[PDB]
Amino acid sequence: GKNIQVVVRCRPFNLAERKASAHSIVECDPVRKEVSVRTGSRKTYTFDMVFGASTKQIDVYRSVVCPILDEVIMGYNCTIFAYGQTGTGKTFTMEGERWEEVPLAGIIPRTLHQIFEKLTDNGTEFSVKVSLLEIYNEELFDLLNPSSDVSERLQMFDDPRNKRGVIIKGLEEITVHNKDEVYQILEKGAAKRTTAATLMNAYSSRSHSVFSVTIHMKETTIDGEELVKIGKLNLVDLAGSENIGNQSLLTLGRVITALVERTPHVPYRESKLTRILQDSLGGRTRTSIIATISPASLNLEETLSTLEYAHRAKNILNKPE
Amino acid sequence: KNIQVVVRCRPFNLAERKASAHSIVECDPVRKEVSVRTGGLADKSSRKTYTFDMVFGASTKQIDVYRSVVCPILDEVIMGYNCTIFAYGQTGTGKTFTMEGERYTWEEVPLAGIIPRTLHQIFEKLTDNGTEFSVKVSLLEIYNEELFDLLNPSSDVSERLQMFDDPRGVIIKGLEEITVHNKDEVYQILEKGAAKRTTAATLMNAYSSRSHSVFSVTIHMKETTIDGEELVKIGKLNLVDLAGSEEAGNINQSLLTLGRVITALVERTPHVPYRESKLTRILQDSLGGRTRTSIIATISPASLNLEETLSTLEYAHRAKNILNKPE
Ligand SMILES: Nc1ncnc2c1ncn2[C@@H]1O[C@H](COP(=O)(O)OP(=O)(O)O)[C@@H](O)[C@H]1O
Ligand SMILES: Nc1ncnc2c1ncn2[C@@H]1O[C@H](COP(=O)(O)OP(=O)(O)O)[C@@H](O)[C@H]1O
Ligand SMILES: [Mg+2]
Ligand SMILES: [Mg+2]
């Protein structure tokens, strides 16, 4: 439990689902923190939080991200994952759509927005840098490198200074000079993802996208302390859930269950994704998974697998009704 | 020949586009080939190709599928034969669109599917023709190997139907057969039906994507001519909307059996297993003789769906194996 929170966000019905007379098979209870699926009876699950279909972008940021970002600012490493079937709002949650953050903008812009705000406001001295890479078929593609050819992919090495840490050789890290750059950066990176799909067949719903902001901080108070700090926040938009049956999800899972159940050897090195994230992941870092689901019976089968998966990663006991 | 296998590819849907899927399907009507790009990471040369009796691209209109697949079969039905057309494929790829369409007036609406078009043509031809005739229709769905009657006004309830063995025929006790007096009458019947189907889904959890759905139109004809060979005929046309190809081993088992039946019919090999599934037994009547049977395999253009599209083409190729040809 503790460091690791797991929450389910359910999206609204889409046009397709309506048009097909699809039935809402999912009950979301925010307050009892329970999801239920009608299979007729019902299977009920419990999570640290549950977000019904009416929840706005800000509600998510506020109850999920804020605690974590406080911790990153404190100079730690965190990860927020979005897991679930394609079309259930992973990206929507993680990025969003087009001064204050447009109500449709998701976690990544808000995160960037907030970072500047707080550090400017407390007069901390800091520099922000972001990087974006996707993992397709256990192979790393840098989405921010303006130069490289599409077939170019990055290799990682062990970090001599850090037993948990890793070195991605060649990875572009762009410097961010204000809260608005994020967008055009997210745009560079979308141009490239496209390209990799057209030319390499690495389709975005079939791969993991890892967006990583690293904050260098120096805080100073006369008669106080001089703190030197580096926080880092990896915001991970996972490959579509339906690809199980691909195996990086199973490992990601095996690693979260281990972390939560506290078993002797957490298998980080058995997948690229968890290898890379191994530096968040574990001691005293908030880690969070947002599982996305559809309400409709059209998608029932996948909705279930997602919830089995969330359930398996952090197994909470159903409280008496 | 008698068994026709055809393929219909739909346009992209909203999901696929929100998902950034790319077109992997290429349909060639003249060559009657369909080819799908199978490339994994950095593979652009890997393409799989299949030939069928006809191929429809994403832009093929309702009426054009009708003119091509149906008319020939209907002629056969109208001579007093028992015939079946199937729709097979992954959920969301247009099985129901193809069989039903989307709904008033005399010239069929452009989104009308095979069902209201078929009823159209029957009245239009028999009327014009001076045939003394009647048309009844039944609509049942088969879920979990259990029969349900979607046309019965009463029995709004679970209530399955019991199937006996008629002394290649078979009897379903209690099946509503509605008599149709006018062509335009066919729409309310498809709504009565759609309605029940949906109740069944909400109350019994039989979602239409899990069910085989069977719409049976039986025609009775007496055709007379002076110095003309007075004639009596019964036509029957089974339009079957299959469950999505993607207790589940029950759905799989039946679709597999269908395929065994379809192949047995082509190789002419004796012992086609009409009896392995409730679906094939219910239909044994119209698969039995040498009579036009035809299958429409529906598919998605999108990369997101590639595995299922392949499965579907694999299925259709197994049903009737027609070699890829040169040039
Ligand atoms: N919680 C939500 N509220 C409103 N719209 C949503 C929500 N989740 C998803 N959508 C919409 O559903 C569609 C699929 O979203 P997307 O994030 O692309 O799914 P994924 O990235 O998981 O494949 C998009 O049109 C998105 O705007
Ligand atoms: N060939 C097609 N042309 C135009 N629209 C189509 C086609 N096939 C399917 N659609 C649309 O796609 C959606 C799903 O079709 P549907 O027939 O319900 O698929 P299935 O019945 O095989 O699950 C419907 O909105 C339908 O109108
Ligand atoms: Mg997406
Ligand atoms: Mg259907």
In DSSP notation, A60-127 reads HIIIIIHHHHHHHHTT-EEEEEEEESTTSSHHHHHTB---PPPTTB-HHHHHHHHHHHHHHHTT-EEE
* CB contact set of B140 (below 8 Å; sequence gap of 6+): B147, B148, B149, B150, B151, B161, B172, B175, B213, B214, B216
Partners of B202 on chain A (C-beta within 8 Å) are 23
Nearest residue to A239 (alpha-carbon basis) of A124, A91, A60, A78: A91
Cβ within 8 Å, pair A203-B92: no
Of B42, B198, B202, the CB nearest to A200: B42
At position A155, the amino acid (one-letter code) is Q
Do the Cβ atoms of A24 and A51 come closer than 8 Å? no
Q: Please name the residue of chain A whose CA is at the shortest distance from the CA of residue B303.
A: A203
The torsion of the CA quartet A315, A255, A115, A105, rounded to 10 degrees, works out to -70
Partners of A194 on chain B (C-beta within 8 Å) are 20
Cα dihedral sign for A98, A54, A13, A66?
positive
Query: Where is chain B broken, named by the residue before each break, C–N > 2.5 Å?
Result: 103, 167, 246
* Paired residues of B220 in beta bridges: B134, B234
At position A264, the amino acid (one-letter code) is P
Cβ within 8 Å, pair B20-A297: no
Residue A9 CA to chain centroid, in angstroms?
A: 13
Give dist(CA A259, CA B201) in Å, integer.
41
Give dist(CA A195, CA A199) in Å, integer.
6
* Architecture in CATH for domain B1-327: 3-Layer(aba) Sandwich (3.40)
Residue nearest to atom 3 of ligand 1 (CA): A11
* CB contact set of B147 (below 8 Å; sequence gap of 6+): B140, B141, B160, B161, B162, B163, B172, B278, B282
B96 annotated binding-site participant: yes
φ/ψ region of B286 (left if φ > 0, alpha if ψ in -120 to 50, else beta) reads alpha
Nearest residue to B93 (alpha-carbon basis) of B317, B247, B257, B243: B243
DSSP SS3 for B102:
coil
Residues in chain B: 327
Instruction: Give the number of other Cβ atoms within 10 Å of residue A263's Cβ.
Output: 11
Of A14, A40, A86, the CB nearest to B304: A86
In the Cβ-directed half-sphere of A288, how many Cα atoms lie within 13 Å?
Answer: 26
Q: Pull the structure tokens for residue B203.
A: 């109350």
Per-position b or e across A167-190, b if 16+ CB within 10 A of its CB? ebeebbebebeebeebeebbebbe
Give dist(CA A174, CA A213) in Å, integer.
10
Q: What is the Cα gyration radius of chain A? A: 20
Do the Cβ atoms of A154 and A169 come closer than 8 Å? yes
Partners of B20 on chain A (C-beta within 8 Å) are 194, 197, 203-205
Nearest residue to A284 (alpha-carbon basis) of A33, A75, A81, A60: A75
Give dist(CA A293, CA B149) in Å, integer.
33
Domain-wise residue ranges, chain A: 1-321
Nearest residue to B168 (alpha-carbon basis) of B291, B288, B293, B254: B288
Give dist(CA B8, CA B55) in Å, integer.
6
Nearest residue to A170 (alpha-carbon basis) of A191, A199, A141: A141
Partners of B15 on chain A (C-beta within 8 Å) are 14, 16, 86-87
DSSP SS3 for A313:
helix
Give dist(CA A23, CA A17) in Å, integer.
8
DSSP SS3 for B111:
coil
Q: Pull the structure tokens for residue A229.
A: 């700090």
Taking CB atoms and an 8 Å cut-off, how many pairs form between chains A and B?
A: 62
* Architecture in CATH for domain A1-321: 3-Layer(aba) Sandwich (3.40)
- The pocket around ligand 1, CB under 6 angstroms, is made up of A 11-12, 14, 86-92, 205, 292; B 18-19
Cβ within 8 Å, pair B22-A198: yes
Task: Give the DSSP H or E segment for A181.
Answer: helix A181-200
Q: Ligand 1 pocket: which of A92, A209, A238 to mutate (most atoms <8 Å of CB)?
A: A92
Nearest residue to B72 (alpha-carbon basis) of B298, B293, B297: B293
For residue A195, what are the CA distances in angstroms to A79, A192, A244, B35, B42? Answer: 27, 5, 25, 23, 11
- Residue B298 CB less than 6 A away from ligand 2: yes
DSSP SS3 for B22:
coil
Give dist(CA A191, CA A188) in Å, integer.
5
* Paired residues of B213 in beta bridges: B141, B241
A88 annotated binding-site participant: yes
Which residue reads 């389709």 in tokens?
A203
Give dist(CA B99, CA B287) in Å, integer.
19
The torsion of the CA quartet B194, B199, B201, B206, rounded to 10 degrees, works out to -90
Query: What separation in Å is there between the alpha carbon of B243 and the centre of ligand 4?
Result: 7
